[PDB]
Amino acid sequence: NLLVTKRDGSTERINLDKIHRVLDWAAEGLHNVSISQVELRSHIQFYDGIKTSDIHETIIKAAADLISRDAPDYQYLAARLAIFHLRKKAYGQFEPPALYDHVVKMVEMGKYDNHLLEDYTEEEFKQMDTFIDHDRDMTFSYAAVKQLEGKYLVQNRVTGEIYESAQFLYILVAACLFSNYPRETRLQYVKRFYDAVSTFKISLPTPIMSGVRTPTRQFSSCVLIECGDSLDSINATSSAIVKYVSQRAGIGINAGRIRALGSPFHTGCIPFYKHFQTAVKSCSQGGVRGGAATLFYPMWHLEVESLLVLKNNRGVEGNRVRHMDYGVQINKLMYTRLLKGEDITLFSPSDVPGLYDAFFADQEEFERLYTKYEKDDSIRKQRVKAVELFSLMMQERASTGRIYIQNVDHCNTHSPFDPAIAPVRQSNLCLEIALPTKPLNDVNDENGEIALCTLSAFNLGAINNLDELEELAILAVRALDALLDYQDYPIPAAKRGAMGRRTLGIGVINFAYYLAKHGKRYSDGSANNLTHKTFEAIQYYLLKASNELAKEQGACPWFNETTYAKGILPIDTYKKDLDTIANEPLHYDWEALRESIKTHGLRNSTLSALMPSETSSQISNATNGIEPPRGYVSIKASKDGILRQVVPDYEHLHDAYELLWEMPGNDGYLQLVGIMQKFIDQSISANTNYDPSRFPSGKVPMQQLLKDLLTAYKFGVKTLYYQNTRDG
């Protein structure tokens, strides 16, 4: 016989025909999947009295355990089974309720914001319901569904209950972001944004996906704070960190102005760095898991040799600050000393008037001040070999993967911002964000500036052509610009940055896949012109969308501080060496855009930044950001089993892909980064990669570490994020 414990307490005989029928439904359109294999593996685990939801989990997992590169479609079988189960969990049936009824219920339970029912009429919800296609849930892969259920879908984290399904999340994210639009255009924007996200053309960050539609207003995940050389500013910085990490934001901290140990901050940078770390870790599990920051300082800082070794495992605890990452700031002069085999002179920023400012804003003034102060024997200073300093930095980068580089001259010569007014003096956690900041005197100082950036990405694999970006750019720019007015600001100085500059950071995912389907590779220069073409279209259309938004709604209050205001474009200021590695012409009318920006301005001081992705890429079954995949099958541990995800269209594209460790070296990838950077407003989370087994005696030579660093600089690369070393 064999019995089943129904969803409450009742019991019925098992329905094996019903199970077969749901598997048959889930397998429709799929290839190389065996329903009977899934049935065999799951049914052997059933016992007399088995809970109904346990039957479901069992069959889902049985399908999931069969995901491989030879049978990739199990990704979809398992996904659809999971979707089916989640419909039953949320709705007690497969068909979702009408959208109005769902929203009314969720508002009653306090799960959705009641502003939704204020801002839209029942009639408007009925209309939005006609936009919805619940069958787009059948397009998710298994790992996508696990990401949705673990972090996106509104749920009870106490009791395990899930309350919504993916198309309700998508329609309601759209409804909330466009809620203030005039009724003449509102529902058209909603439908269009809904179609863009639910078909994976546009990707949003986790705080937006989990939160927009709910009572929260916490959506800021990326904050940049500059610390001044005073106890008051050190305190304010610490306070602002604590506030933002309790909301789970990643932090970029500029602490390079703090004066060196021994100065007339007599006790040095390090004890303040340690204090920034505990601020970052203040809201973390056991003061370690969660809470993340990258801290920035100049390469010529008097304490630099101590700073460089802060994450090194060995050493005295007093000399170590291991649970933050670091960005070392470098300009042409530092590199020139290396190439010439000369000395670098180290200074405390307190002893060298105008030098810190000049480092970022004015290279000729920096050179003049720097050589001057090097000769003045009244100034406290230290000389080190440029080779030895660079080597130490690269050694620490190599062993941790987490000593980063910012080329601060590139961040300011090729930039949306005038550096005499609004210099870029740091980056964020992940090294793609490059925005102005001002030190705080007090957590509530209204003259400070903390930079924030709202993120999204275009899915390069879901567009049939580049002119689709016109509409996607309109949608993404408008959705994020509206979010700036919607979200909360716990620190006044952060509200100032966001309201003043209205900075956005829209990037890409599925770049590897896109190259593969165009028959190009990373390593050999075959992708150079295609990347030029692609990234031109992104920036042009982003700029066009923001320019139109400015005509309609006003330029951002501090638009006059941008190079954009002076009729300067990214195509005017890029590193010239790029001309030697691509010859793609501009296909769009940048001269017309230039005049329109001069005249109407931009709604947003920045539009583009190339961030890493993991979670949003997984939802789309996209390759992450601009990165080559390590392999064809990605693997994740979970409480629900081993989660596998196969790269998109492995079946037809396996030879077209170039896997990370298949690249003979970093040159081709860095040339692509340089080409992308021609057009990108902010920066790019660029990795370097080294396989020891490609090198004599399995050791990566310092010569190659430095040559790649120099190559990055020469092609105008603004930042370097992770160094990955293959173990193997």
Partner: peptide
């Protein structure tokens, strides 16, 4: 591990 050997003459060629 890495190889800290640096040819300082090879570097001087490079053009930033």
């Amino acid at each position: 591990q890495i190889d800290s050997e640096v040819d300082t003459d090879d570097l001087s060629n490079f053009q930033l």
